[PDB]
Amino acid sequence: MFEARLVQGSILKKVLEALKDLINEACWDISSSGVNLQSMDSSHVSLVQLTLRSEGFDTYRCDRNLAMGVNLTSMSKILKCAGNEDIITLRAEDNADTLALVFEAPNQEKVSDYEMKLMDLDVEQLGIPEQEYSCVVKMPSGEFARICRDLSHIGDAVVISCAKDGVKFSASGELGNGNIKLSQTSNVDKEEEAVTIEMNEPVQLTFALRYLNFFTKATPLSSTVTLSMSADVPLVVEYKIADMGHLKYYLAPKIEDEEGS
Amino acid sequence: MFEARLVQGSILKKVLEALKDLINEACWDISSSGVNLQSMDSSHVSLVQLTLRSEGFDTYRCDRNLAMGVNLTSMSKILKCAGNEDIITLRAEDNADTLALVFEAPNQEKVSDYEMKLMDLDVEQLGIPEQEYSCVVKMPSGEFARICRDLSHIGDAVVISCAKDGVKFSASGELGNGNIKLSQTSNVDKEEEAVTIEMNEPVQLTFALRYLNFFTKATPLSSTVTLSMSADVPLVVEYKIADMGHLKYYLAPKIEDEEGS
Amino acid sequence: MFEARLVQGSILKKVLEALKDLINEACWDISSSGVNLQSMDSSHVSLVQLTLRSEGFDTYRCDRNLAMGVNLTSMSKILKCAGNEDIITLRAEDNADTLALVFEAPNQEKVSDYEMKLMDLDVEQLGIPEQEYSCVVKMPSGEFARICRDLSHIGDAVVISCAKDGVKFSASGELGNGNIKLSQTSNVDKEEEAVTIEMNEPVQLTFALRYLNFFTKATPLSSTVTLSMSADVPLVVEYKIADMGHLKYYLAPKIEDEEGS
Amino acid sequence: HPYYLRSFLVVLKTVLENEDDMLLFDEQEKGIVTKFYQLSATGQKLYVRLFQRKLSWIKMTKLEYEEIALDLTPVIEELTNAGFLQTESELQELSEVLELLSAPELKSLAKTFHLVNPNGQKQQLVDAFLKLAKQHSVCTWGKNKPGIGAVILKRAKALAGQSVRICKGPRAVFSRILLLFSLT
């Protein structure tokens, strides 16, 4: 019997927004140690992984490992009906095709219950090759969302050059070309201001901005994003959901001959 | 000639938006008692009644009774140009051909005048019956509006159930089923943030959600909304217009089809 | 070479926004006196003049007078990327066709660099005759900005009828007629609330509104419009750009004989 | 139409009296034509009409012809069994199904994908989709399974539904027949 009591419903509310437009259907892999989501987009180019642990859950009970196929758009519709302060009581019955969402009003006057139907998708056990990253970047989430939104107008591709003096974002289009670069923060102790860059070898790659805009819809989840990248490896964007888990994205670099042909 | 001075222009403003999307034409029967409006809706389903007591107005005078056929959509457009804190001075002469609006300013530095064209309409009066109701609920206006929009994503039929400890808002759509219950609390000193139900006999009805969404448009008028229903009796939704008057909203329940057979 | 350093980057953003919907391409005439622009509108109805004196810029230098044809639409999109407090650093070199805009964050942590592609436009200069006007009115920008928007819902022709004790922005339409009459104010401590009017002859005119709505998009630049007209002379709307320059707007009055047909 | 029924069969039964015509047609064509007469009298119309029509994978939901029946589906089953009306069956051809799909439907399919400029002119989205065929490097993120095109055709057939088409063999042989009849 699956029964989870989550105090901060906004945390679950935010997650669905990040997945609502990028993925429509996915398998909700659940274990006795926490939740685990992992799927691919329709265009089959990006990988999303969610590592929600069990410690953050106020009440966790997973008698057996389950996997439920749930319409992400359908979940978002139901989730948006719960306030940003309620107590989620997601609770699932063994092979019943019924996800009993229960919204607990902190005012303790309103009782809200919903049930949604479960689809039957198929699992593909996506292998995730652990592999180190030459260039490591952490910098506050808003500016990254700012930068990736600004360069959308000028172009469609971005050249990220992990320079030791500062990461520089460049795009080229028929409106012109523009480069944006930052400087490593030295004295500001605020964790929401550091632009620290870890350097192992210089790297330059290319990515489609239509997906970078999709990724950053999860800015309210955390203040700092972590970018790790190296030669011929997919881009990884990392968010830290407080202390209950992390939300990492995977973006394969645009092949260097795609623009040639 | 008819002259009315209203200090609170926002009150008259808030009235129009509620009525603008539901009713196109109306007859404003004007007497020394005050302002009256009764108008059967466009789709020939719901009924809207409006009353404004003359005593609440700062200045009021009407020698002989009058009812004007006035376009709701057009006259609503004009008031959008008036500030929320103006001192409206609705005036219309005995020779009923045009309507004068005398929008003012709090600083008495800018005055605005507008002229409205009247229309001749057939005054079809319907005698509503005055009777007691089985289950009556007073509960915060904002919460009711939130409930209506939330269940609107599930189905098109909310099932009302006056119960022991509150109401049993129930949505039943193809995507799922949604049950929401509000616990009856009365110990709260703030009457605005309280729900009180008087019980005489249990009765269960159903109404379409499309009208319920429109019915909520008068939300800013007041913080508390009163609901009364009984067996085979149209639903009653009333908004208390400060100390000015009141607005009642009528909707007959659907006939439960023999879907069980 | 041409180098300009403006601390108040908001001025350029607001200026660029104002001319977006009225002018597609313009030739920027620059001299040692400062930046000047004169480009008659796309619809071939209104004339726009804009001037920037040199001393207003924190740092200004220009070896030879140049004239660049800039796609006005593209400039704003690049400008939209700049923040509300950056130090714009307009710079062009020799006989190139590339505008080098530079945005600098106040904390010196984020350096934004963009480049444009100039285009060749014919330099068409139109004489501006200087003469005296009949009614000159200095009135707060927000009040007028409200006025033009308000009268749009009625019709498409204002009738300004300057008099000895105020203004009478009347209008008319199929819905009716709206006569807004502001009252002359003289005893106000602040200059952002005075509507001082100087008149020699009474004047009654007529103008097209859809331009006027475009015409007030420069509202955030100032809070004091210096609108002025004379007999058979195009309307003059001027905003004082802090201590930077002036942005004057020209519109010829409409002919009454066209309204007869 | 009576004229459609009246003529075609008349054309065949007058081209029947010419020993040269059989001298120029093999036994297989003769057997097909015998099958064609063997077809039901009311089943003649569906092959009679669509033959005198545009050759394309087109859905039955668009068809409105009712003078035979509103639910003449079993006749189409008979035609498919005999081997004239190829149903959905072997539909794995990306270009054909994209032509089959409708423009608003194409826009919708673009929305659920992450293409560039998912709002343009009909064929432009089609070659934009065919551009996605240049692939088999990113679908190899995990398992190889290169059927990106399989995914697109699956979702399109779900979007489109059923459709049919005429086999080239019959079309060709009766085109030969009526052109010999014309001789012009």
Side-chain angles (χ1 to χ4, degrees):
Chain A
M1 164 159 184
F2 195 13
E3 171 184 9
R5 175 175 172 82
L6 170 60
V7 179
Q8 313 76 0
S10 63
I11 286 170
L12 209 184
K13 278 183 60 75
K14 288 166 187 175
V15 162
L16 264 286
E17 323 261 16
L19 303 192
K20 143 201 169 300
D21 230 345
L22 184 73
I23 299 165
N24 41 56
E25 314 204 50
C27 95
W28 262 93
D29 191 348
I30 186 51
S31 159
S32 45
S33 92
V35 198
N36 277 80
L37 206 152
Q38 161 150 19
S39 46
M40 291 275 248
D41 56 43
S42 86
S43 293
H44 212 210
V45 77
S46 73
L47 161 68
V48 191
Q49 182 214 316
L50 206 171
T51 311
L52 241 186
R53 254 186 319 284
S54 159
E55 284 86 308
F57 285 98
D58 195 290
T59 320
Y60 198 83
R61 166 150 161 283
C62 175
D63 305 337
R64 165 196 66 266
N65 311 357
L66 272 301
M68 322 68 68
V70 188
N71 190 318
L72 280 293
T73 312
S74 304
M75 206 179 206
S76 47
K77 300 291 279 306
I78 287 181
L79 263 298
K80 86 205 183 274
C81 307
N84 324 297
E85 45 271 1
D86 307 38
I87 307 171
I88 307 314
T89 316
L90 199 185
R91 190 235 65 70
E93 167 32 56
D94 314 328
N95 49 276
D97 315 66
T98 49
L99 265 168
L101 294 294
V102 163
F103 304 145
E104 187 181 345
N107 54 69
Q108 306 231 338
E109 325 289 354
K110 183 200 254 190
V111 185
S112 147
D113 174 23
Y114 303 70
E115 181 273 354
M116 92 185 278
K117 296 174 184 174
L118 275 62
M119 321 305 98
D120 287 340
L121 287 304
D122 313 278
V123 57
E124 323 96 298
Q125 51 304 340
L126 285 38
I128 316 95
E130 190 279 298
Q131 160 36 277
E132 211 269 341
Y133 301 102
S134 309
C135 155
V136 155
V137 154
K138 57 179 315 299
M139 52 146 278
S141 50
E143 306 66 8
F144 189 70
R146 175 172 310 295
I147 279 171
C148 312
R149 164 191 61 280
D150 304 323
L151 289 197
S152 156
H153 303 106
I154 171 175
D156 270 27
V158 52
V159 175
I160 299 182
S161 158
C162 191
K164 79 90 182 172
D165 89 10
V167 47
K168 58 170 298 312
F169 303 76
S170 309
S172 173
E174 81 292 332
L175 299 194
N177 39 31
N179 96 77
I180 307 165
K181 63 187 307 308
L182 309 183
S183 41
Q184 310 86 303
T185 283
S186 307
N187 67 10
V188 188
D189 46 349
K190 314 302 298 307
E191 63 67 26
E192 52 274 62
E193 259 322 299
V195 200
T196 281
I197 307 193
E198 170 52 86
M199 171 35 78
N200 199 9
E201 51 261 46
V203 317
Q204 308 91 328
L205 313 97
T206 307
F207 313 91
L209 278 295
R210 58 176 142 168
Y211 285 108
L212 277 193
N213 289 337
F214 283 147
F215 286 3
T216 51
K217 290 288 183 180
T219 52
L221 258 180
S222 175
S223 63
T224 66
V225 306
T226 300
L227 279 73
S228 266
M229 53 189 337
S230 193
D232 314 328
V233 286
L235 161 74
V236 294
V237 188
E238 165 166 356
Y239 290 68
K240 206 75 81 203
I241 300 96
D243 48 333
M244 321 64 69
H246 62 80
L247 187 65
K248 295 181 179 183
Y249 297 68
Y250 293 80
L251 183 59
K254 210 181 251 199
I255 58 184
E256 298 53 56
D257 221 43
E258 212 155 10
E259 321 83 10
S261 34
Chain B
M1 156 295 309
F2 141 71
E3 172 187 10
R5 147 65 71 81
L6 182 43
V7 175
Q8 277 325 93
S10 63
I11 284 175
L12 202 173
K13 284 178 60 76
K14 291 157 188 175
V15 160
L16 264 286
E17 301 107 1
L19 304 192
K20 76 162 189 175
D21 42 8
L22 196 58
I23 304 165
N24 282 335
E25 321 304 311
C27 329
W28 310 58
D29 298 35
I30 293 286
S31 66
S32 163
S33 64
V35 185
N36 192 344
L37 164 155
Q38 173 285 337
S39 69
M40 191 305 278
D41 71 328
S42 96
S43 54
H44 188 26
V45 183
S46 69
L47 183 94
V48 178
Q49 176 274 318
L50 210 155
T51 304
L52 305 175
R53 257 163 307 115
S54 55
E55 303 92 12
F57 299 96
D58 211 289
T59 314
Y60 193 93
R61 59 133 286 161
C62 158
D63 293 337
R64 184 281 301 180
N65 88 10
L66 153 64
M68 311 85 78
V70 172
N71 190 318
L72 267 297
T73 312
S74 306
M75 172 285 258
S76 165
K77 191 73 59 61
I78 283 182
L79 322 183
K80 185 230 57 77
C81 302
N84 43 22
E85 43 171 31
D86 311 341
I87 326 179
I88 316 191
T89 325
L90 255 288
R91 175 211 311 295
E93 83 283 55
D94 168 321
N95 185 352
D97 44 18
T98 42
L99 168 38
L101 304 103
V102 193
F103 308 158
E104 300 194 19
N107 59 0
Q108 316 86 29
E109 298 290 348
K110 160 195 166 184
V111 306
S112 324
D113 178 22
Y114 303 82
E115 258 188 4
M116 210 39 268
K117 295 177 184 174
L118 322 179
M119 161 55 48
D120 203 359
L121 284 167
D122 190 301
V123 197
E124 284 178 3
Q125 166 303 329
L126 293 137
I128 63 185
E130 303 81 20
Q131 101 281 9
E132 83 295 329
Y133 286 64
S134 306
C135 318
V136 290
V137 170
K138 54 183 317 294
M139 71 66 68
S141 148
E143 283 304 323
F144 191 97
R146 156 170 317 127
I147 280 174
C148 283
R149 44 178 195 64
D150 293 355
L151 292 192
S152 283
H153 300 289
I154 301 306
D156 317 323
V158 155
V159 178
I160 289 294
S161 294
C162 75
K164 179 25 54 194
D165 194 13
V167 54
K168 259 193 50 56
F169 293 106
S170 312
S172 165
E174 51 86 33
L175 204 33
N177 53 317
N179 310 31
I180 302 169
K181 180 199 311 308
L182 314 154
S183 308
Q184 193 277 337
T185 165
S186 324
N187 47 87
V188 175
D189 48 72
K190 296 151 298 312
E191 328 289 354
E192 48 272 66
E193 245 292 335
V195 50
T196 288
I197 167 178
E198 199 276 340
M199 181 45 148
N200 314 305
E201 55 256 25
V203 57
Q204 275 56 237
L205 306 91
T206 317
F207 332 99
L209 261 167
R210 184 291 290 281
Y211 281 135
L212 265 285
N213 289 335
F214 285 141
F215 290 170
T216 48
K217 197 60 62 64
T219 288
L221 265 305
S222 180
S223 60
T224 71
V225 47
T226 303
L227 288 105
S228 309
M229 50 313 292
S230 195
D232 310 66
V233 168
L235 162 74
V236 156
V237 184
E238 177 274 344
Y239 290 72
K240 182 56 186 103
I241 312 299
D243 43 332
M244 177 23 63
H246 86 288
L247 170 76
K248 286 183 177 183
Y249 257 37
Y250 293 9
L251 172 63
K254 35 197 87 162
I255 302 171
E256 268 185 359
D257 279 339
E258 266 182 358
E259 268 179 356
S261 324
Chain C
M1 71 66 68
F2 158 37
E3 167 192 9
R5 174 176 168 88
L6 166 56
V7 172
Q8 286 253 319
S10 65
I11 292 170
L12 261 156
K13 282 174 61 79
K14 297 156 190 173
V15 160
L16 256 298
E17 191 43 42
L19 322 182
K20 194 133 191 193
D21 41 11
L22 198 60
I23 300 166
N24 267 23
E25 334 177 28
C27 197
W28 289 60
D29 303 359
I30 49 138
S31 72
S32 157
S33 67
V35 201
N36 190 348
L37 192 173
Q38 165 157 320
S39 73
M40 181 285 258
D41 69 333
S42 309
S43 100
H44 293 67
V45 172
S46 68
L47 178 90
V48 177
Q49 179 269 3
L50 159 47
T51 308
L52 294 293
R53 331 179 299 292
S54 56
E55 66 292 30
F57 296 86
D58 215 314
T59 295
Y60 198 100
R61 87 174 298 285
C62 170
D63 304 336
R64 168 198 48 257
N65 300 356
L66 264 283
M68 40 297 301
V70 182
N71 192 324
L72 192 43
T73 314
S74 305
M75 192 102 158
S76 165
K77 268 181 307 307
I78 276 175
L79 262 296
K80 218 170 181 323
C81 307
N84 273 336
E85 55 272 3
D86 295 69
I87 323 170
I88 325 299
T89 325
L90 266 282
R91 152 177 297 93
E93 164 68 272
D94 265 9
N95 65 353
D97 56 318
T98 47
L99 207 38
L101 319 91
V102 170
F103 314 142
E104 304 171 351
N107 57 2
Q108 318 319 311
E109 296 287 342
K110 172 184 171 185
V111 176
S112 322
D113 189 306
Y114 301 70
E115 272 197 20
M116 217 143 189
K117 34 178 60 170
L118 271 47
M119 78 167 335
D120 197 0
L121 259 287
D122 56 80
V123 182
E124 275 182 0
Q125 202 290 324
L126 294 136
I128 316 299
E130 298 78 18
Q131 89 305 329
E132 295 322 277
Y133 294 98
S134 308
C135 215
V136 284
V137 46
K138 157 68 63 186
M139 161 265 278
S141 60
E143 212 72 16
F144 189 87
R146 176 82 40 68
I147 289 306
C148 38
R149 194 172 54 269
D150 292 357
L151 284 198
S152 35
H153 299 310
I154 302 303
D156 286 72
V158 297
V159 180
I160 292 104
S161 53
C162 158
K164 326 314 157 209
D165 205 52
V167 295
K168 195 171 295 319
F169 301 64
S170 152
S172 169
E174 37 86 16
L175 284 191
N177 57 72
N179 318 337
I180 317 186
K181 174 246 177 40
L182 168 149
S183 310
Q184 201 293 322
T185 84
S186 54
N187 42 285
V188 180
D189 56 327
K190 71 205 72 62
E191 289 332 283
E192 192 256 352
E193 202 61 25
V195 68
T196 306
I197 39 175
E198 182 270 287
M199 199 213 79
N200 46 70
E201 267 49 65
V203 55
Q204 280 61 229
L205 298 171
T206 309
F207 313 89
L209 269 304
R210 167 195 30 53
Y211 294 91
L212 255 292
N213 287 333
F214 293 145
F215 250 93
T216 49
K217 301 292 304 317
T219 301
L221 286 170
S222 172
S223 53
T224 39
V225 179
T226 316
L227 180 174
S228 309
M229 66 307 297
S230 167
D232 90 347
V233 154
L235 195 32
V236 158
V237 191
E238 154 172 352
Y239 302 78
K240 289 303 299 315
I241 306 305
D243 192 7
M244 200 43 277
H246 49 77
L247 176 68
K248 300 153 41 55
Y249 280 83
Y250 288 11
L251 175 59
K254 194 48 48 172
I255 308 174
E256 270 179 357
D257 269 347
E258 267 179 355
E259 268 180 355
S261 72
Chain D
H1 275 147
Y3 284 140
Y4 277 74
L5 202 50
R6 168 225 50 176
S7 268
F8 207 169
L9 286 88
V10 161
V11 202
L12 289 109
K13 63 77 190 171
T14 88
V15 71
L16 164 58
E17 36 279 48
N18 167 39
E19 81 93 24
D20 315 327
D21 168 33
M22 335 311 148
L23 280 179
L24 267 285
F25 267 126
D26 61 33
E27 293 304 316
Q28 192 275 347
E29 285 129 7
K30 280 158 187 42
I32 307 310
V33 181
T34 66
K35 296 178 182 70
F36 197 137
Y37 332 108
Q38 147 276 298
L39 188 64
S40 162
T42 206
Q44 209 71 339
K45 269 50 67 178
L46 330 179
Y47 204 88
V48 152
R49 308 313 289 276
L50 152 62
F51 193 49
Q52 199 260 5
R53 209 201 319 278
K54 50 225 303 162
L55 191 165
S56 34
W57 274 92
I58 88 164
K59 93 189 63 206
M60 155 281 295
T61 326
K62 185 42 65 176
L63 320 171
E64 78 86 32
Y65 174 25
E66 214 276 330
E67 281 40 51
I68 307 309
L70 203 33
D71 78 327
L72 42 57
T73 320
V75 192
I76 318 144
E77 271 86 72
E78 174 199 19
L79 300 183
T80 301
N81 288 322
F84 333 121
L85 281 293
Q86 162 156 19
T87 180
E88 319 174 77
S89 59
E90 188 278 306
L91 200 32
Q92 50 281 49
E93 177 46 271
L94 174 59
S95 306
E96 298 181 14
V97 55
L98 282 41
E99 321 316 300
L100 174 56
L101 198 85
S102 186
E105 277 190 330
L106 261 183
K107 159 156 289 300
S108 68
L109 184 36
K111 205 53 81 153
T112 166
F113 261 90
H114 293 350
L115 301 118
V116 153
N117 158 9
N119 37 6
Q121 272 314 328
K122 294 70 188 183
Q123 166 286 347
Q124 152 204 33
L125 295 90
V126 189
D127 63 302
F129 256 127
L130 301 153
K131 180 40 219 83
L132 269 294
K134 328 303 168 303
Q135 175 38 263
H136 303 167
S137 320
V138 188
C139 305
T140 87
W141 204 116
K143 305 143 293 293
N144 164 277
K145 322 183 307 173
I148 164 175
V151 187
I152 318 144
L153 51 66
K154 279 200 273 311
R155 311 168 155 279
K157 274 180 281 194
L159 268 279
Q162 45 75 30
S163 153
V164 292
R165 204 181 61 181
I166 321 180
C167 328
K168 313 158 52 57
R171 163 141 290 191
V173 308
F174 313 82
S175 66
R176 299 305 321 285
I177 288 175
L178 42 59
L179 75 89
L180 316 203
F181 167 80
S182 87
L183 178 35
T184 310

